[model samples]
Target: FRTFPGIPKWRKTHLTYRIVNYTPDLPKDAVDSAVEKALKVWEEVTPLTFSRLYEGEADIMISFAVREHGDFYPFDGPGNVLAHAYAPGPGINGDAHFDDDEQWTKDTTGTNLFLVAAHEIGHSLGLFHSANTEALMYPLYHSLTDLTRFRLSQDDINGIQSLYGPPPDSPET
Candidate 1:
């Protein structure tokens, strides 16, 4: 069994997230939609849900950070560490940061925001990367894959479902 520092169940009906900064490659709305779509990946599968915020502190704050942003793990400019997210907790926890140095894209041309966000949010929601390559939680980022194709493999399903349980009542529990 795998264990994550966050929680199996979040307190709110809608987990809130805010995008602090923008990348030059994509427009604000486009970037936002990409992120929103990513967060929706998990929310769509279970009772979990998310809402976006334009101002103030949100449960999950998504932003672009360069070098060290007060975090012990600093961004390695562009490629090495494309992005990272904190587990749910006090202050910076649940906050996600992307390296602005990388070329972000809505399509396959560059790093896909949806793919990365989905993985990161998995971290935020008390999940970790899987050894299985087919799992979305597989550590490596895939830009070519369609975001909609992202699904929970048996391991992933077993992991999160173990925490939250079969999306209410689907008989699989």
Candidate 2:
């Protein structure tokens, strides 16, 4: 038996997701690149594979471009609410919103879209901010980042895996 109630345990499940409504802050291609890269973070961690949706229903709705939209959490202009995503639920579940108020840059020069989007998506997928400093789910906002090197800490992985499991396992592994 496990002592901790919140900690995530390893399991096998092929979690699939999709992105909707690309952000207008950057070019459409840039938005696609950033979002795909962000989702890749979680995908690479486990067996999760994501698909991009152009029409109709999707598990995760991805929107780029920004500010005080719908939902309870009104995004504060610019820096305050770099981006936010709803926790998983019916319909609006897994919807990500970015504050268009901020000048979103592809590189780390501005608020890191990949980082912020990744964090918000973390929330969308039923992940909360982590207390650990090294975690990707940590609440602190960072403008500068090293995507080539950044990764989820054990605690963060355990937390996410708790909800979705360790992606899906193949017959061989």
Candidate 3:
């Protein structure tokens, strides 16, 4: 499955996001950079662009939580569950929650914030876990270290593009 059938997606090309809180594991700057990069991975392929919000509401609201947060899905302590995000919609829709219980890091030494954020944001943009094992949407952590070299798999590209279509100025189009 990809996007939920008939589920709402952001009708506009540009979207806004806000990181409501920070994680204790990584420096504030590190988390900021990771979130920016994660959002860029999707922005580069689709016409969609993301703007960060310092105050007020945003289309995507992000934060770190432990155990039972506000939502129905209370995260397990550490290993099993990592993070979760909502599908596109009104209030609380497209919100992403990270489990603060885990050691979020900038490298492979711990749970990679960039990787998890990318995956969660993929869901926030309306993608589902792909059967393709190499996909970012595969719903598993595979120890990705080279952040500079990160690339989305064909399955991920196809799925996302199916919803948002290709970037406006892409040569491929």
Candidate 4:
């Protein structure tokens, strides 16, 4: 996976995230599960961790919004652009915004919530749209055939691992 210009990465390993609001389409629990699994995919690879916050500002804020919600890069209807996120930093930085106009779903088919959220999370951690189409950080959106067996590509594995070295366990083991 490719990375941003300044190569912005979180200096800290443990991060806190808060979902700004719940989308009307999916149930609150569904949204919560999607966000959790998406974060799980990355944490499994990187030496990082995340905690959910019910209130207060978090390092990485999550939200679903329609056109012209807040940020300058407004959502266009639904298909064209699914989401965008800021690089790692303070304040609004590193936050992720999902396009509610699109039919967000929990299944592998349709606009997969986990897929989109996973990609957006990559950005929140500093990765950019990767040239490798097979990589999770790829710019375009695509549904997985079976999320149960979903795994990041070598490109993605290498990219995220490079950002944060191996987990603290085996050093001379």
Instruction: Give the root-mean-square deviation of each candidate in angstroms.
Output: 2.9, 4.6, 2.0, 2.0
Tens-digit lDDT track of model 1 for 1-173: 15654344567656788898988778999888867887777666656777876677888888888888895987766788877876676577777888887888876667887777777777777677777777777877654356556666676666666666524566665
TM-score of 2: 0.78
For candidate 4, the TM-score is 0.90
Best by TM-score: 3
Taking all chains together, each candidate's TM-score versus the true structure is 0.85, 0.78, 0.90, 0.90
In order of lDDT, best first, we have 3, 4, 1, 2
Error of 3 at 136 (Å): 1.3
**Local distance difference test scores for all models:** 0.73, 0.65, 0.80, 0.79
Clash count list over all predictions: 0, 4, 0, 0
Which candidate ranks first by lDDT, i.e. highest? Answer: 3
Candidate 2 runs further than 4 Å off: 1-24, 64-67, 143-145, 167-173
Model 4 scores what on Cα lDDT?
Answer: 0.79
43-102, model 3: which lDDT tens digit per residue? Answer: 877778888877888888888788888758888788777888878887666888888888
Candidate 1 Cα outliers beyond 4 Å, as residue runs:
5-8, 143-148, 166-173
What local lDDT score does residue 10 receive in model 2, on the 0 to 100 scale?
A: 26
